[PDB]
């Protein structure tokens, strides 16, 4: 027959001050997952609740010497608050001094990486297999071959042939494309020139095809980590963690081989992969362009993935399994009713609906959602543009040839 004081913490989306904070006061000033969850819990239990924030602004913990509980756990143990509706992890030490409910969320450690963006292949990417030096030297060698052919085919007075400079250019160009023309050299000198040019073109074009094949084959065998083991084995990618937190606890006290190896690499690194705050890790992932992987709670990873900017993705399954729960003091009367309400809401789908609402519906990205490896028009666009430009230039040159011949 009284109002119950519900402690809480400020952590998006669980609880966060509303935009019109000044207009509203008390419970109506806050919005989030846990305020609505507390509303539903109160309705199922039929108790009136006044919401409050933890002064320490932090989750429970015991000072080593003082042996004093801080945060929400301290508020509960010392009688300050009756209930704690918040992302309070279930742990052995806490469960001893407070009564947890059954989990309303299941989570774990998860991997956060720079999002693989839709790369633009690049106009004139069809030249990538060969360096621009090769292409330009090809052009200049073409000019030289044409000139030498014209010379060795026309200088001798006894012939004055069909191998003028223009037709020499045409023959050389057709030779490079492996498309013969109406004329072939008949002299030994012209035939030597043609032979060396032919050999050159054969080697060059086979090299182009082969290196393009290599490019595409290598792009076709690239596999993202998709897991911790893939992350662990490779050393190219640096994977960090918050310096202080249960994640470091998990990695230090981990008997499993891969997590022990991850700790070995994290402690033995320079610059320190670890970061002071989670915002630091997120910005570092975004800036480092795939060189950084951040290990953190799955829920925050999902929320961030749904926030603007949309340049971050969660990979793999959760490494470990934990759970958040509603906590009350030992000997309280609300423990059983609260646990039953949590289970009721879980079965009814209320919690899933709230998760979707506050993680996805409110999501700036707002997008839950074609690997083929077939070449697209973007891969070969430059050659189409060259074709169109050449056709236009040909029309223009025909127009010039027509204006010329006016007499």
């Amino acid at each position: 027959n009284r109002t119950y004081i519900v402690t809480t913490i400020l952590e998006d989306p669980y609880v966060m001050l509303k935009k019109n904070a000044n207009q509203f006061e008390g419970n109506d000033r806050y919005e989030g997952y846990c305020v609505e969850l507390a509303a539903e819990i109160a309705k199922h239990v039929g108790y009136s609740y006044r919401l409050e924030i933890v002064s320490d602004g932090k989750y429970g913990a015991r000072d080593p010497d003082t042996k004093a509980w801080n945060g929400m756990v301290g508020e509960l143990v010392y009688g300050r608050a009756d209930v704690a509706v918040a992302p309070l992890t279930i742990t052995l030490v806490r469960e001893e001094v407070i009564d947890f409910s059954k989990p309303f969320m299941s989570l774990g450690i998860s991997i956060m990486i720079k999002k693989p963006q839709k790369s633009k292949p690049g106009v004139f990417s069809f030249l990538d297999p060969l360096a621009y030096e090769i292409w330009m030297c090809i052009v200049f060698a073409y000019i030289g071959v044409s000139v030498v052919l014209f010379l060795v085919s026309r200088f001798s007075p006894y012939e004055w042939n069909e191998f003028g400079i223009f037709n020499s250019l045409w023959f050389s160009l057709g030779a490079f494309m492996q498309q013969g023309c109406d004329i072939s050299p008949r002299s030994l000198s012209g035939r030597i020139v043609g032979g060396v040019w032919w050999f050159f073109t054969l080697i060059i074009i086979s090299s182009y095809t082969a290196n393009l094949a290599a490019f595409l084959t290598v792009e076709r065998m690239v596999s993202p980590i998709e897991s911790a083991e893939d992350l662990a084995k490779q050393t190219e990618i640096a994977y960090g963690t918050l310096e202080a937190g249960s994640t470091k606890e998990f990695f230090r006290r981990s008997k499993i081989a891969v997590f022990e190896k991850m700790w070995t690499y994290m402690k033995s690194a320079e610059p320190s992969v670890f970061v002071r705050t989670t915002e630091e890790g997120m910005i570092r992932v975004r800036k480092s362009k795939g060189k950084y992987a951040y290990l953190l709670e799955s829920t925050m990873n999902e929320y961030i993935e749904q926030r603007k900017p949309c340049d971050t993705m969660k990979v793999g399954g959760n490494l470990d399994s934990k759970g958040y729960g509603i906590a009350t003091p030992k000997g309280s009367a609300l423990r059983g009713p609260v646990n039953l309400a949590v289970l009721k809401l879980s079965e009814q789908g209320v919690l899933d609906k709230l998760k979707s609402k506050w993680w996805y519906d409110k999501g700036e990205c707002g997008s839950k959602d074609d690997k083929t490896s077939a070449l697209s028009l973007s891969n070969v666009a430059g050659v189409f543009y060259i074709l169109i430009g050449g056709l236009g230039l040909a029309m223009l040159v025909a127009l010039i040839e027509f204006c010329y011949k006016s007499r």
Partner: protein
């Protein structure tokens, strides 16, 4: 016209020679980071003979390139020693310039001794050979710059050499056509 054709041939020969000499003696072939001037290195415009860094207290300081920063068999180690020797000597660009000069001399001397027409043929041969030497030279230069992701770029001496090649081939064509006209006229 024959006269203007010869004039263009001579002007092109002299222009190509000037462009090639300037390219050889300017030191703006390559832009890159070297570390010979203050990890990645300091911006510097190299050349064919000397390298000049433009960052730090060594501004405007041009130090000679060595072309032999390792140990190899001086007598005959492998093709790399020959490549580095050719790159250091730069005999192919110099040969192209020499041949262009000789071709221009022959073209000018064709005005006198106008009876002899093989002079223009010799000039065209010299121009074409000069173009070929230029091509070998640039291939050697580019190959010898390969260390084994450092951004680099080419300057105006490089493109002056390219222009020299183009003009040499053009004037070779013109000289051959002139010789052909002369020979046909005598028939």
């Amino acid at each position: 016209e024959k006269g203007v054709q010869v004039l263009l041939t001579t002007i092109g020969a002299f222009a190509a020679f000037g462009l090639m000499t300037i390219a050889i003696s300017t030191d703006y072939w390559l832009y890159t980071r070297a570390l010979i001037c203050n990890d990645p290195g300091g911006l510097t415009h190299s050349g064919l003979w000397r390298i000049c860094c433009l960052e730090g207290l060594k501004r405007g300081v041009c130090v000679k390139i060595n072309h032999f920063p390792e140990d190899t068999d001086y007598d005959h180690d492998s093709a790399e020693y020959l490549l580095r020797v050719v790159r250091a000597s730069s005999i192919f660009p110099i040969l192209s310039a020499i041949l262009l000069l000789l071709g221009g001399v022959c073209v000018a001397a064709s005005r006198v001794y106008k009876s002899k027409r093989n002079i223009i043929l010799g000039a065209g041969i010299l121009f074409v050979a000069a173009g070929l030497s230029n091509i070998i030279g640039v291939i050697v230069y580019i190959s010898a710059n390969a260390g084994e992701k450092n951004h680099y770029s080419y300057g105006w001496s490089f493109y002056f050499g390219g222009l020299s090649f183009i003009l040499a081939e053009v004037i070779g064509v013109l000289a051959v056509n002139i010789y052909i006209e002369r020979s046909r006229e005598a028939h």
